[PDB]
Design a protein around this ligand. Structure first.
Ligand SMILES: [Mg+2]
Ligand SMILES: [Mg+2]
Ligand SMILES: [Mg+2]
Length: 755
């Protein structure tokens, strides 16, 4: 490029910056092409072009002016890149703002989609505000290759689509531009199939939707509705390894945490809307908006000390009672709680408070509702045609055809979509087994084997691997969490080593061992010490997340207190012991709303949590307990640096089954950060109980779950204990501890203490 062309851009004289900024082809070689990418980045000193899917990074050079950058790259195609931009001491990573010159689909868009590789297909499919033939309007496009016809129906044409019939491109995708309508436009697609039958669909790539049980899509100007402030949070995440950090997740179902009064409007970010009544059964109650949740859930979680909030599925879904796990609007956050910009504000505000957001994401199935993806164009489009792999009969739902390019693309791009447009920090996928197995919940003679005679769902495995491969390339630093309940191997290992590419897996065996264990009468736990210890045997085969989830406090399983034997005092003490053990045991942590304050009743999604319990001391003390434990977790490196290395853990002794006592060490990089953890899982106190420790010195009683401020009896070691030079548990020194009833102690050598 020339200085004259550069100055035209710098001083805003150029007639069309897309001519020059973005990606342009310079020449074709035999096996490759030469491209240039150009950017104008005022205030940046430096920049790079990242090609995350090839694992490459090329620097940009300033050309004629210090904020005008060029990068020449040779590669056969340059579809997938990002710009890294350094301003002062800060870097951000973004998509090229000059990537797309027009709102319509190009040949290249269509070709990439046909192959299932269009990582940004949602910039073109769906509905977007733009300009064509010099007029402002909305471009619509939808994949429906077997339709006989499609028209856009909406408010703007009184649901009559005769003058808005769409044009079919390449036998596959229908499009139409509609002048002078914009955001807020309510619309559907009217489709005629090959039999002549006419019906209506919501937009598969819709960015907003009417409030259930209405289903019309709504047009969103998704890049011009919200201003973010979380650059520093994103930089920190991209440059860190969350596996080496504390991760304590508060799991939350947004629709049932807290309700408000349906006799007022639902406030939104700089506006308001009609209330969304939680149900006809409870009509005085409404849902809180994303905006109100940002103002109330977030400081609550911050004060509790959790690092992350994990949301039950917020993609648009027609029935409250699915909890979100049956989705029909994969590209829009549910309108139950307001608008897209309200949820953006919610994420932006978590990031400001130092809190990550993890989304339960549901690529495993979708329900049959006629507004949604089913039988979309008069054929089995999204779902596989053979019901032996295309329906989950026991659930009444349909299974995506993962092997079909455009279907894979829908989902792969959908996952990237929440990271791109909504800045989320992770996903969690429920029931991965449902995808992995061709015989899932299917009886003999009702499924067929793969091409090698096995039960592995090859297409699904390949899809899962591509999702995880792409996520971590484009957004390093995220959490990808699996619950997989059949001991499939290498769930949380790299795809290159034969894994599925997740970086965490729920430890369901651990959950079952713990809840079965605490449910047993204390005198009988002696027969079941293996429940305490067994999961350390397989622990190092995955990176484990220790989750006590929503699923474990419904359907007659009781809430946590109710699972526990004994009198009221003992029930609380059992909860404190269980969770102190959870937080000290290796692995990341997840717990569900209501567990942190001892709700007696089961989670019931038709109401909100029983907040009134927090008027009473026991519930308050338990909440203080979790607040303190979370703070401890963040303060003590040995609780999080080495979760997944042998170094990080060692049993001291775990054979005293007769008193249901176990003890262990946690370690970090600095030997002085080592912790000694001692657990007493019966109500019998012990005034003298010797535990081997690795070093002489004073061991501070850093934490005690029987402290009175937690509702305990306040028994313990009055600050700490000097180790005796007295070999025990194969260790040269030892502590003669007082062990409180149904309680866990954490101790720490203070090497600077005065003897
Ligand atoms: Mg009509
Ligand atoms: Mg057993
Ligand atoms: Mg209530």
């Amino acid at each position: 490029i020339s200085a004259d062309q550069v100055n035209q851009i710098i001083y805003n004289l150029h007639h069309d910056p897309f001519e020059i900024l973005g990606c342009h082809l310079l020449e074709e070689g035999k096996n490759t092409k030469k491209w240039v990418v150009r950017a104008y980045l005022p205030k940046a000193e430096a920049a790079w072009v990242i090609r995350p899917t090839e694992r490459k990074e090329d620097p940009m050079n300033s050309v004629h002016h210090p904020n005008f950058f060029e990068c020449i790259i040779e590669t056969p195609e340059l579809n997938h890149y990002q710009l890294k931009v350094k301003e002062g001491e800060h870097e951000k990573v973004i998509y090229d703002p000059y990537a797309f010159s027009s709102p319509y689909l190009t040949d290249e868009d269509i070709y990439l989609f046909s192959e299932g590789n269009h990582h940004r297909i949602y910039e073109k499919l769906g509905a977007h505000v733009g300009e064509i033939n010099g007029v402002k309007g909305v471009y619509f496009a939808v994949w429906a290759p077997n339709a006989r016809n499609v028209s856009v129906i909406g408010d703007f044409n009184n649901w009559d689509g005769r003058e808005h019939q769409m044009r079919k491109r390449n036998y596959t995708i229908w499009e139409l531009f509609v002048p002078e309508i914009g955001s807020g436009t309510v619309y559907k697609y009217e489709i005629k199939n090959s039999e002549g039958h006419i019906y209506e669909k919501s937009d598969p790539y819709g960015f907003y939707r009417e409030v259930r049980p209405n289903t019309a899509s709504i047009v969103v100007d998704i890049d011009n509705i919200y201003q973010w402030h979380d650059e520093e949070w994103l930089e920190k995440r991209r440059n860190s390894d969350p596996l080496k950090q504390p991760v304590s997740v508060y799991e939350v179902h947004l629709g049932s945490w807290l309700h408000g009064s349906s006799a007022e409007k639902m406030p939104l970010l700089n506006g308001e809307a009609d209330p969304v009544i939680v149900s006809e059964w409870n009509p005085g109650a409404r849902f809180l908006s994303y905006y109100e949740l940002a103002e109330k859930l977030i400081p609550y979680v911050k004060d509790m000390g959790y690092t992350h909030i994990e949301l039950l599925p917020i993609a648009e879904h027609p029935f409250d009672g699915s909890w979100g796990y049956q989705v029909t609007g994969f590209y829009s956050p549910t309108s139950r709680f307001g608008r897209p910009e309200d949820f953006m504000y919610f994420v932006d505000k978590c990031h400001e408070n130092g809190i990550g957001v993890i989304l339960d994401w549901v690529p495993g199935h979708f329900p049959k509702d006629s507004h949604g993806l089913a039988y979309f164009d008069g054929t089995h489009l999204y779902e596989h045609a053979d019901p032996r792999i295309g329906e989950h009969k026991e659930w009444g739902t349909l299974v995506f055809n993962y092997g079909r390019h455009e279907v894979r693309n829908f989902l792969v791009a959908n996952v990237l979509f929440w990271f791109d447009k909504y800045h989320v920090d992770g996903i969690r996928v429920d029931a991965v087994a449902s995808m992995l197995y061709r015989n899932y919940l299917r009886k003999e003679g009702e499924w067929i084997a793969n091409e090698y005679g096995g039960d592995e769902h090859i297409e699904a495995v390949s899809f899962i691997r591509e999702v995880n491969t792409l996520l971590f390339e484009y957004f390093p630093g995220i959490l990808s969490i699996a619950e997989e309940s059949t001991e499939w191997e290498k769930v949380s290992r790299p795809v290159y080593d034969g894994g599925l590419g997740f970086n965490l897996k729920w430890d369901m065996g651990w959950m079952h061992d713990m809840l079965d264990y605490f449910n047993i009468d204390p005198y009988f736990r002696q027969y079941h010490q293996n429940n305490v210890t067994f999961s350390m045997l397989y622990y190092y085969n995955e990176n484990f997340m220790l989750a006590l989830s929503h699923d474990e406090i419904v359907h007659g399983k009781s809430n946590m207190l109710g699972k526990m034997p004994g009198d009221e005092w003992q029930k609380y003490a059992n909860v404190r012991a269980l969770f102190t053990y959870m937080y000290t045991h290796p692995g990341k942590k997840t717990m569900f709303m209501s567990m942190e304050f001892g709700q007696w009743s089961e989670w019931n999604v038709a109401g909100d949590l029983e907040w009134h319990l927090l008027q009473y001391e026991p519930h308050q003390q338990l909440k203080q307990f979790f607040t303190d434990l979370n703070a401890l977790y963040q303060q003590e490196p040995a609780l999080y640096t080495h979760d997944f290395e042998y170094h990080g853990f060692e049993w001291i002794d775990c054979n005293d089954n007769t008193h249901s006592v176990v003890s262990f060490l946690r370690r970090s990089d600095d030997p002085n950060d080592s912790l000694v953890v001692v657990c007493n899982f019966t109500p019998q106190p012990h005034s003298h109980y010797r535990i081997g420790v690795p070093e002489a010195g004073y061991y501070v009683e850093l934490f005690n779950s029987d402290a009175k401020q937690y509702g305990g009896s306040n028994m313990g070691n009055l600050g700490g204990k000097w180790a005796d030079e007295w070999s025990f548990h194969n260790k040269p020194y030892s502590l003669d501890l007082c062990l409180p009833p149904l309680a866990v102690l954490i101790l720490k050598l203070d090497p600077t203490k005065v003897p």
